[model samples]
Target: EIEHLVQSVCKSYRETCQLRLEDLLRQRSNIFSREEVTGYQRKSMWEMWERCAHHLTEAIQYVVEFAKRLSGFMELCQNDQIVLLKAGAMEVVLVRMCRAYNADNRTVFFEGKYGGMELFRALGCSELISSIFDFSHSLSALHFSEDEIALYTALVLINAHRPGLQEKRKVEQLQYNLELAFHHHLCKTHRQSILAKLPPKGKLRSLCSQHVERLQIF
Candidate 1:
């Protein structure tokens, strides 16, 4: 049963959430030059912010779709679902960004092309951008398989402690099942050691806080 859950989650992830950097690079039809990306530094910051926001909004939509497809998530109280999504969306987005991150060149897939830090220099949120890039870099180092990524994302969204949850116990129960399934998958695959290397929740939380602060400044 747990393996089935893993299979479904993996399917949902591939269908809705996965954005392979290799595929993106191969399909690159419009290549933005370094000059074009750096030109954003000359334009208004609003333009740069809007570009980033557009990508993030798309990612959040995928997160919601993925959440809806996860087993038992739809059975939660509607208010609980909203609360969990509101609290966990950004965290999941951060995790999902690793798929688009190209660690070799320190660039991320932004808008239509791979963009380095120079592309976002106009936003004036250098610290937040750096933190995000750092988080993505470390996560990419883990080299997680699709199944592990799916389970990790589900764990992020199903947390019981999210504020405003209407049925905490139900959420907790679902989270427990996901955790068991995740641990089982890890052990069975001989990747149990990754449990210790997984990025700490606090780091994601702190990055979320920084992102919020950057938005407020914008």
Candidate 2:
């Protein structure tokens, strides 16, 4: 009975992310056009950085709005919500990059422009930049459908575990159930290798540290 409610809530939040889903519904072509890359080197880092900041803001805002729509989000202690947002904001945004990532060609569609991985490397971004480019490619290879991505995003949000949380155990149970559901929906029925290269949770926690520090938004 409780697991049913969990699934229902995730599906309900899918409706909340309709705008994001609409924008991402189309699958990208694998071709990396030479024409687009012609002036890629001429673009200014300042402008590129500005646009990256905008993308980051959009990613953060989308997660914030999704939190507001979550079934159990408001029921958590206000302080807990704040902590969760602080901790998980970068992770969600990183996951959000999967929408704009093209696995086949290994490029990112950022702010009305497409950039090759080398473009980011030249912009003074460190190794973390390399990690996301590669990570996005790996995640995109999974080819998550709109609904599937929505549930996974929600799962990321709800799975945050902070010390002294009011309902820490309940949230942990919710997180575990969501993981089981992810495997059920993505693995058991379909027999897809969607999570084949996905790094373990500990690595994600480690990245959370670098993710926030590196993406300080100008």
Candidate 3:
């Protein structure tokens, strides 16, 4: 009752759309009864059809909203007449923006990437990216580490900032994260592991390179 009352007068278009999807998703599950089929038999069938339908609908809505947002971001681009803000969903807005900008191809701008990152920043997420460092203190412990958050911020600035002649700062917090391997010894591990896994340095740069090249497969 309260949710309905609140939603009834809500002013945000995006919020309304999101709520409707949530409602549909709830009803979809609520209205369905599981088949008498056993758990093993259920494995042969698919679930998430309703969930996916909700997602596709949401993605289409996103493309339309994305167009509107891009119009604004385009005015801020380094190039006049070039469109920007072409990648990323609400999740990982900064990383997605960097990815979209980095990808030379543009097919992803219109279609949903599934879990693939968006090419443009969604609304509230953009505001979050703009002010993330300022809000660092409020973050949960897992998210508090500078290295975890800074990597995306650094990537976003990669093209925007000029080449640095000199700068200095310590990422003290995440440095301790290195004990696992990448935490402290990634450079050494990278070399050693690459050699151990790869065929040889003759065709490959090093075993490390082969390890890295095939890391995805393993």
Candidate 4:
């Protein structure tokens, strides 16, 4: 019975991931852009504040709302729900923004504007900023469809070892199943590609960790 429940949870999460991805791509213009690249540009303090602060809150709300639609997610306690949502929000937002990454042009689009690596470096961002670009670059080449991104995002959320969770085993099993499903889906779609050669288990998590640590200083 436990095994069946776990599998059912995996199935539920898979469908949830796929649906969310489809919806995101369907409304990409609301959050991302892919027009031609442009020259030196930086959002003003107000615009920057909107995205960094106000928009961030909206991104967090989006995460919460999206999770509520997943049965497995709602099964968790509200405390765990809040913890993972905030922790995972940073990763989710980063991944969504990364959809704009154009590896060929080495630029990442933000809202209506676009900027290459040089522009970001010139704006006083740290090497971590460049590293994120590299991560986005590699991620773009992987050709992750919306479903893949959603699966990975869900996996990242469930994998969170949030403090005070009573259902540790449940969360761990869900995370494991999601990982297997993600790998299997990738292999089924692109056997010739290097999905098999990509980082094992920790790339996205590590990236999230880096982002969280950076956020502490700001």
**Top candidate, metric TM-score:** 1
- Arrange candidates by TM-score, highest first: which order? 1, 2, 4, 3
On lDDT, the stronger of 2 and 3 is 2
What tens-digit string does per-residue lDDT give for candidate 3 at 178-204? Answer: 122222232443433322432221321
* Candidate 2 global TM-score: 0.75
> What lDDT does the true structure give each of the candidates?
0.83, 0.66, 0.26, 0.59
lDDT of 4 by residue, 43-137 (tens): 44344333455545666566666667654778777777777776676676666555767666676655444466654332344576777787788
Which segments of model 4 are wrong by more than 4 Å? 1-50, 118-123, 160-163, 190-218
Stronger candidate by lDDT (1 vs 2)? 1
lDDT of 2 at 209: 78
Which candidate leads in lDDT? 1
Candidate 1 has what TM-score? Answer: 0.91
Candidate 3, superposed: residue stretches over 4 Å from native: 1-31, 36-54, 57-71, 78-86, 90-218
As for TM-score, the candidate ahead, 3 or 4, is: 4
- Distance from true position, residue 42, model 2, in Å? 5.3
How far residue 115's Cα lies from its native spot in candidate 4, in Å, is 2.2
Model 1 lDDT per residue over 110-172, tens place: 666777777788778898889889999999899888789999999999999987888999999
